[PDB]
C-alpha cells in the first residue's frame, strides 16, 4: 500500500489522509513543497536556455559551412534534432506543468509529451550507437574495399528513427504505457508499476535488453576496437609525434564518450532493475526524478562532447558567432 492508483496514473503517496488527487486534475503539493516544483521549473529553464542554443546552433552552422555537410556528420545533426525534440516536446511542457504543480494537459497530453520526449531521447541514444559503428567501420576497416558514403549515412539515421519508434510507439498502443512520473509534472514509460493489462513486465525487459544492453555492448566493442587499432598504429609508428598525440586524444575522448553514455542511461537502467527485483518497495517522487535529471541533462552535455569538442564544428561555430570572422 504505497501510493494511490487511478485509471491512468500512479501517485507515489499514500491516500490514507484522503488528500491525493489525480495528477491530471490538481496540484500535487503533498508530494513535494511548492518551492521544489519551482526548482523543477528552474531546472527545465536551465536546460532550455543551454540546450536550445547549443543544438540549434549546430544545425544553423551546418547550413552556413559547406565543409560540415559530409556523410559522417549526418548522425551528429540527427543528434541535435533529437536533443530539440527533448527541448520542445519535454522541457518546455514540463516547465509549464511544474508551475501548476501538476500535469494540466491531461492524459492525451501525457501521451504526447511522453512520446516526443521519449522519441528524442532514443534517437539521441541510438545516434550515439550508430556513430560508434560508423567510426569503427571507417577506422578499424573491418571490411576491405568498403567506402562510407551518403546512402549509408542515411540508413544510419533511419535506423535510429526505427529503433526509437520501437520504444516510444508501443506504449501508445498497449505495450507498457505513458503516465506521469515522479512529481507528476512529466510523463514517461511505466516501468515501475506492474500493470498486467499492458504487460509492463516484459516491456521493461525488452527495453533493458534491446535499448540498454545491446547499445552498451555495441558502443564498448566498436570503441574498444578503435582504441585498439589506434594504439597499434602508434606503437608501430613511434617515429610520428603526431600519431602519438592522435592516440592519446582518441583514447581520452573514448573514455569521455563511454562515461557520458553511462551517466546518461545507467541510472534509469539501475533504477528499473532495482525496482523490478525489489517489487515490494516504495519509491517516492524525488527518487523517480533522479534517473530523468541525468538523461535530460544530456541534451546539453552530449552536444558539448560530440559537437563542441569536434574541431570542425567548433571553428565554424566560433566563426558564425563572430559575425563572419576568426
Amino acid at each position: 500500500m504505497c501510493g494511490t492508483e487511478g485509471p491512468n496514473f500512479y501517485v507515489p503517496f499514500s491516500n490514507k489522509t484522503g488528500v491525493v488527487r489525480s495528477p491530471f486534475e490538481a496540484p500535487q503539493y503533498y508530494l513535494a513543497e511548492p518551492w521544489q516544483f519551482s526548482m523543477l521549473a528552474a531546472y527545465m529553464f536551465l536546460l532550455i536556455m543551454l540546450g536550445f542554443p547549443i543544438n540549434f546552433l549546430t544545425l544553423y552552422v551546418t547550413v552556413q559551412h559547406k565543409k560540415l555537410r559530409t556523410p559522417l556528420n549526418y548522425i551528429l545533426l540527427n543528434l541535435a534534432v533529437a536533443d530539440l525534440f527533448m527541448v520542445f516536446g519535454g522541457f518546455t511542457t514540463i516547465l509549464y506543468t511544474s508551475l501548476h504543480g501538476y500535469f494540466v494537459f491531461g492524459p492525451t497530453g501525457c501521451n504526447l509529451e511522453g512520446f516526443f520526449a521519449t522519441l528524442g531521447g532514443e534517437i539521441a541514444l541510438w545516434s550515439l550507437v550508430v556513430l560508434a559503428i560508423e567510426r569503427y567501420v571507417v577506422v578499424c576497416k573491418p571490411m576491405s574495399n568498403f567506402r562510407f558514403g551518403e546512402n549509408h549515412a542515411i540508413m544510419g539515421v533511419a535506423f535510429t528513427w526505427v529503433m526509437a519508434l520501437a520504444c516510444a510507439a508501443p506504449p501508445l498502443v498497449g505495450w507498457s504505457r505513458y503516465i506521469p512520473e515522479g512529481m507528476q509534472c512529466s510523463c514517461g514509460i511505466d516501468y515501475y508499476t506492474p500493470h498486467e493489462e499492458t504487460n509492463n513486465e516484459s516491456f521493461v525487459i525488452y527495453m533493458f535488453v534491446v535499448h540498454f544492453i545491446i547499445p552498451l555492448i555495441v558502443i564498448f566493442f566498436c570503441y574498444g576496437q578503435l582504441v585498439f587499432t589506434v594504439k597499434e598504429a602508434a606503437a608501430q609508428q613511434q617515429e610520428s609525434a603526431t600519431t602519438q598525440k592522435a592516440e592519446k586524444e582518441v583514447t581520452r575522448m573514448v573514455i569521455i564518450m563511454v562515461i557520458a553514455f553511462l551517466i546518461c542511461w545507467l541510472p534509469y537502467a539501475g533504477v528499473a532493475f532495482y525496482i523490478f527485483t525489489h517489487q515490494g518497495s516504495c519509491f517516492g517522487p524525488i527518487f523517480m526524478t533522479i534517473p530523468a535529471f541525468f538523461a535530460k541533462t544530456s541534451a546539453v552535455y552530449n552536444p558539448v562532447i560530440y559537437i563542441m569538442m569536434n574541431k570542425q564544428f567548433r571553428n565554424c561555430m566560433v566563426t558564425t558567432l563572430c559575425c563572419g570572422k576568426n
Partner: peptide
C-alpha cells in the same frame, strides 16, 4: 590512418 580520425571528428 589520421585521415580517417580527422574525418570521423576524433582528431
Amino acid at each position: 590512418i589520421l585521415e580517417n580520425l580527422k574525418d570521423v571528428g576524433l582528431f
